Write an enzyme that holds these catalytic residues in place. Structure first.
Site, mmCIF file in Angstrom:
data_model
loop_
_atom_site.group_PDB
_atom_site.id
_atom_site.type_symbol
_atom_site.label_atom_id
_atom_site.label_comp_id
_atom_site.label_asym_id
_atom_site.label_seq_id
_atom_site.Cartn_x
_atom_site.Cartn_y
_atom_site.Cartn_z
ATOM 1 C CB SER D 241 30.113 36.925 46.120
ATOM 2 O OG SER D 241 31.363 37.452 45.715
ATOM 3 C CG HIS D 271 30.597 34.675 41.610
ATOM 4 N ND1 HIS D 271 31.772 35.289 41.233
ATOM 5 C CD2 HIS D 271 30.265 35.203 42.811
ATOM 6 C CE1 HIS D 271 32.134 36.152 42.164
ATOM 7 N NE2 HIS D 271 31.237 36.119 43.133
ATOM 8 C CG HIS D 317 41.269 39.065 33.219
ATOM 9 N ND1 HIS D 317 40.718 40.328 33.190
ATOM 10 C CD2 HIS D 317 40.923 38.533 34.415
ATOM 11 C CE1 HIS D 317 40.066 40.549 34.318
ATOM 12 N NE2 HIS D 317 40.175 39.475 35.079
ATOM 13 N NE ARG D 326 44.117 37.300 42.278
ATOM 14 C CZ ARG D 326 42.805 37.285 42.068
ATOM 15 N NH1 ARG D 326 41.972 37.102 43.083
ATOM 16 N NH2 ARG D 326 42.325 37.449 40.843
ATOM 17 C CG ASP D 372 39.831 31.232 39.549
ATOM 18 O OD1 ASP D 372 39.678 31.119 40.786
ATOM 19 O OD2 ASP D 372 39.361 32.183 38.885
#
Lengths: 144, 341, 439, 438
Positions: D241, D271, D317, D326, D372
């Site tokens: 993006s 994405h 990750h 986050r 997420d």
């Protein structure tokens, strides 16, 4: 050129060759009588022909609109509309025949079976149960 | 004075092209003339000696006969008929010769398909059945589109998310490539409660070129449908998501919709007419036997009325289209035949 | 019978996939380039960062579609009956498969695209209500995005299809998209610049003919122009912004509709898809200053004044191509065989005879030769396409062939998501410091 | 007190000079190599973007101008009565590198609200799009329809100087940012509701205007959006993006076309929907365990998922060696607002054992959750249950960092991004010549 058309009442009507040629019955003559057609009815026919889709193109004939002038021209009494239609059928004025039928259909479309009988003087030979079953059938033809 | 009956027969036949449903309710003359009109349409389309009439005669009569609770008094206006049989000609057959308007429409559009295993790996076949498809469905899609609607029972709004993982595979039986008709993946998110939902999967795609079937006299083709469970879950096994069947009815042409909900019902007969499905399934099966020597991959099912007002709550496609419950309550039943020609 | 485009590609793409696998396994660790700090801050200029199979720019022979020059495709590709112009459908077959299609295969492909040309009702309503002051390239990208409701890849991905079936739905979406592009482009032209009345689509006409006819012309010479225009603009490597953007968005598995719409937005940038319009404005400014005197003296006077003023001659001077663009010559041959005495073409022709020498004497242009953009504006203007803002829409109608061809190829071989690494200027300072410290 | 445009006018020349001298002194320094497997592997590892807004610290998570999530939670101005950072304040930080004051953020929110009214043709556009057109597609269409209002495209046609590009790019970005909550809510009401917009507060902030227009007055929902629209604002410039918006913008397309192209990249399944992949995985787990969130049963599911060859979404990750701040920022919101929520209790039980199971499995390098894993549960608690709309919320947030780097690019005159391409045949011939010379 000018051709003369005689009505059923004896009155002679002088008309241009081409304006008469809108009738296939006349264009197939190889003074023309037009029996059982009133003088006033033949007057309206010539007037319509002066002011103005092929056969086997029935879809385009059903898609054809009614000219605004023809609409007011056919805004006569119901008896005259019948005889205008009848004369267009005898002389094979199909463009006029379609216009007259679309106007009659416009008087019928959306009206109740009782209202159509009163407007067109039709006797009801259905039983109340036969009308109820036909009404259900016609509902199957609607968008729901 | 004068009357509409005083006009010739050719004028009556033209008026029947513009206002058939109004005229056929006027008197017996126009009703019988309207019935004769669709006799000519049907026979000029499928001749009296054609193989279609030979193979569908009885099942077609049973379909029309199931409509008698709604139209028997209208059908019996024509009395000179006999029960269908080898020695009774087509123009004298009961439930056909007195029902050309309904027979013609029943042959001009694909009928419903019911999941006969509705009350019973990584991919499981939920359903596989047939319906008879007019060969020219694509070239008439503007005035007569062919939708594909799927019927589901959804236990709750949460299991509705598995609807996109049930795959609907369509194609001609033993002919051509098979394609998949589907909705957008997030139409499930518009389902917010338990109920029976009718989801529009779009329109029937181009399955072939119609010119390939020109000069061969083919009027119908066997349309095969296969529903595949690719949910990777037990939502169908637990009957939390049950496939009721399919239809091809263009409900509410004036108001495009994504789905609609009806209240959960005890009987699938409120949605599907078993005699209609039996007619369509047998019609398609007989066609597959006559048009191909290849063996049909599934056993021949035996499909074996009840019309009641069921209120539908639509999720419309245009955001400006608002709800009109009063119009929905007043509309005629939607589980009745759809006469479109 | 005759193989379809999809069937032939289905037989070919597994071979290309295996060839890429063994190629990377045998030489994957081979360093093909270095990354200098100036290149990162210079827009990755000179860095190999794209695998584009459709076309490669030969520095001597011009652009080569699958090894075929402009002269090659004008000889090998099928043409319409009574026409000498190559068909853009035939080039799309060549770009995707690498082979030359037969004359029946091309007419079959044109019929399939025409079958898919019907615009959904909501797209037609969408374009008919957009303001005329909204740029046509914006309306183009909007209509392409609006077709996402019909995307078969998006619906199939929600159903959880296998990764080995991605290309099939990408292919059907691309053909559904290409078939509607002329209808979209013409609908914008009729609404913005005309009376909004667009014709219906002729079933047996080709890609470029449908565009011209719906735009409002039955002239077969105009149709022959679009057949050439849509061909030579179909593809041009993968480093340009429009082609690069479509690969990037497509690498995240977005449908061909979103990939092309993003690519069309990049083509809408003034630094990419406006070269043709800049030439036409510079020509009209030249046409007024000389009062229609295109003599060798007056043209040479204007060129030297322009070069002395600091501006460049638009369309002349390329960084790689050493000779005149064969796409320029093919456009010159079209004007000489159709309208040799055209006033605006005589201006372009006299510049072609004078500008290469003037630029050579100025000494600041390495390759003083024209390109396709120096000659396309005059050909469009002759047949009535005098609205320059619509010119980038025509570019997009052509470039979508090379864009969607590469997208189908990327899905067939399971191409990776393009995700480079990024840093801030502060972190770039730290990285460079450590390299020189250890050097 | 100086506005956002004025402070940037004072800082942007300094950045331009530093870049010019940095390349003039170190431009010929090689910083990486290009292997054949990298260009065929999506440019993995190749440095190909200059992004100033945020950098991922391998130990402390994402850093917005060097400031971590913990730093921005304390330093950034907030709404009155709220402990959540306003997304407008982070946008000020991303563009200038300096923490704004309270009055500066409040005036920036008022300026955005003054640019929030949609043109008539955009409203008529969205009100006629069909509901089976995906919300992300309607999002990018509406942004593109605003191109007729572009102050940069019109100024470029008149012939402005190159040093004035940033001024019109700044105005287009703020006109665009002010209309994103309105567009996102208009799409939500039309597709999933009755199409009626909520009542608008003139002094409302960015995230609050989104919630009220969606149709909720709950201030805890407004605080969730302030948190959500902040922690999703930016994350380097390598993702699809951000890279797309820079790529399209590098050709001097207006912020409208640049953001619309980036949104199409975010609309990609690979994405902008890891949020939704987690939510689908939790619901599948919730059906299997029949809502038993014990340690013993959850570990069995995680082991069965891992032993079968599948991954645990949201966990794992390649760079970050610690748990994403986050993620914990959303867990804190849950325990402070709805600790007894059934869906959150499932997320917590997984958080309590999944790092141990993944470590013991030995196939995941960094077994830690990201943003997420916890984003969906909070949205579900306030009625945002339609997963297809989550990517629209992602775009409403990521547009901040996208337009921040875009304004910086025009301020320093960033060059168009044009890499070199070859065919597989030409790559073979290149490899053959390189290896022959040795």
């Amino acid at each position: 050129s000018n051709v003369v058309l005689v009505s059923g009442e004896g009155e002679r009507f002088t008309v241009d060759k081409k304006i008469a040629e809108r009738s296939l019955l006349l264009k197939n003559y190889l003074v023309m009588p037009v029996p059982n057609v009133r003088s006033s009815v033949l007057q309206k026919v010539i007037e319509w022909a002066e002011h103005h889709p092929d056969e086997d193109d029935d879809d385009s004939r059903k898609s054809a609109p009614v000219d605004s002038w023809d609409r007011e021209f056919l805004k006569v009494d119901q008896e005259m509309l019948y005889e205008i239609i009848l004369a267009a059928n005898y002389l094979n004025i199909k463009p006029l025949l379609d216009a007259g039928c679309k106007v009659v259909a416009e008087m019928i479309r959306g009206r109740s079976p009782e209202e159509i009988r009163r407007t067109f003087n039709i006797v009801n030979d259905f039983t109340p149960e036969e009308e109820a079953a036909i009404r259900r059938e016609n509902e199957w033809a609607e968008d729901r | 004075d004068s009357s509409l009956m005083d006009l010739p027969l050719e004028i009556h036949l033209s008026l029947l092209e513009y206002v058939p449903n109004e005229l056929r309710a006027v008197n017996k003359y126009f009703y019988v003339l309207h019935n004769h009109s669709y006799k000519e349409k049907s026979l000029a389309w499928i001749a009296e000696d054609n193989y279609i009439w030979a193979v569908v005669k009885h099942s077609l009569c049973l379909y029309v006969k199931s409509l008698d609770p709604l139209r028997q008094h209208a059908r019996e206006i024509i009395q000179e008929t006999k029960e269908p049989g080898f020695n009774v000609p087509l123009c004298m057959t009961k439930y056909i010769a007195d029902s050309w308007y309904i027979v013609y429409n029943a042959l001009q559009y694909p009928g419903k398909i019911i999941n006969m295993g509705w009350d019973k790996p990584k991919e499981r076949t939920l359903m596989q059945s047939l319906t008879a498809l007019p060969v020219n469905f694509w070239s008439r899609k503007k005035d007569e589109p062919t939708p594909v609607n799927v019927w589901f029972y959804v236990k709750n709004a949460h299991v509705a998310r598995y609807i996109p993982k049930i795959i609907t595979e369509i194609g001609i039986c033993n002919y051509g490539p098979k394609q998949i008709v589907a909705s957008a993946g997030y139409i499930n998110e518009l389902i917010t409660s338990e109920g029976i939902y009718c989801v529009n999967l779009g329109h029937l795609p181009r399955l072939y070129d119609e010119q390939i079937f020109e000069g061969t006299g083919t009027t119908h083709l066997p349309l095969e449908l296969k529903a595949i469970d690719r949910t990777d879950s037990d939502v169908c096994i637990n009957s939390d998501l049950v496939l009721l069947g399919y239809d091809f009815i263009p409900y509410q042409i004036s108001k495009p919709w994504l789905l609609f909900r009806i209240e959960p019902v005890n009987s699938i007969e409120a949605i599907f007419n078993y005699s209609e499905c039996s007619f369509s399934y047998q019609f398609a099966w007989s066609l597959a036997c006559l048009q191909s020597e290849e063996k049909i991959s599934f056993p021949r099912d035996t499909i074996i009325y009840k019309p009641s007002k069921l209120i539908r709550i639509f999720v419309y496609k245009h955001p400006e289209q608002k709800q009109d419950l009063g119009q929905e309550i007043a509309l005629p039943n939607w589980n009745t035949p759809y006469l479109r020609r | 019978q005759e193989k379809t485009l999809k069937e032939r590609f289905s037989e070919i793409y597994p071979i290309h996939a295996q060839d890429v696998r063994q190629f990377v396994k045998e030489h994957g660790k081979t360093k093909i380039s270095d990354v200098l700090l100036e290149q990162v801050y210079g827009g990755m200029r000179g860095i190999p960062g794209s695998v584009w199979e459709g076309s490669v720019l030969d520095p001597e022979d011009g652009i080569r579609f699958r090894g075929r020059t402009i002269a090659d495709i004008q000889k090998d590709l099928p043409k319409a009956k009574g026409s000498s112009q190559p068909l853009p459908e035939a080039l799309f077959w060549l770009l995707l498969t690498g082979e030359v299609p037969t004359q029946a295969q091309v007419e079959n492909l044109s019929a399939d695209l025409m079958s898919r040309s019907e615009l959904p009702s909501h797209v037609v309503q969408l374009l008919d209500n957009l303001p005329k002051d909204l740029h046509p390239m914006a309306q183009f990208s909007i209509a392409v995005t609006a077709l996402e409701s019909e995307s078969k890849f998006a619906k199939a991905y929600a159903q959880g299809i296998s990764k080995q079936d991605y290309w099939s739905y990408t292919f059907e979406d691309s053909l559904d998209l290409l078939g509607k592009l002329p209808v979209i482009a013409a609908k914008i032209y009729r609404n913005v610049f005309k009376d909004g009345k667009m014709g219906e689509v002729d079933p047996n006409a080709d890609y470029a003919k449908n565009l011209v006819n719906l735009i409002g012309s039955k002239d077969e010479d105009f149709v022959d122009l679009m057949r050439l225009y849509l061909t030579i603009h179909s593809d041009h490597e993968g480093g340009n912004v429009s082609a690069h953007t479509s690969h990037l968005v497509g690498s995240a598995l977005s449908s061909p509709y979103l990939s092309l719409a993003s690519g069309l937005n990049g083509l809408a940038g003034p630094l990419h898809g406006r070269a043709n319009q800049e030439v036409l404005e510079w020509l009209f400014a030249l046409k007024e200053e000389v009062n229609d005197d295109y003599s060798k003296d007056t043209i040479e006077k204007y060129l030297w004044d322009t070069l002395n003023s600091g501006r460049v001659i638009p369309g002349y001077g390329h960084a790689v191509l050493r000779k005149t663009d064969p796409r320029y010559m093919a456009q010159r041959k079209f004007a000489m065989d159709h309208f040799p005495d055209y006033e605006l073409f005589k201006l372009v022709s006299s510049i072609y005879e004078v500008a290469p020498g003037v630029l050579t004497e100025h000494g600041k242009t390495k390759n003083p030769w024209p390109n396709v953009d120096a000659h396309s504006g005059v050909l469009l203007q002759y047949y009535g396409l005098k609205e320059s803002s619509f010119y980038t829409v025509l570019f997009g109608v052509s470039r979508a062939f090379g864009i969607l061809a590469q997208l189908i190829t990327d899905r067939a071989i399971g191409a990776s998501i393009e995700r480079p690494k990024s840093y801030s200027t502060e972190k770039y300072k730290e990285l460079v410091k450590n390299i020189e410290s250890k050097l």
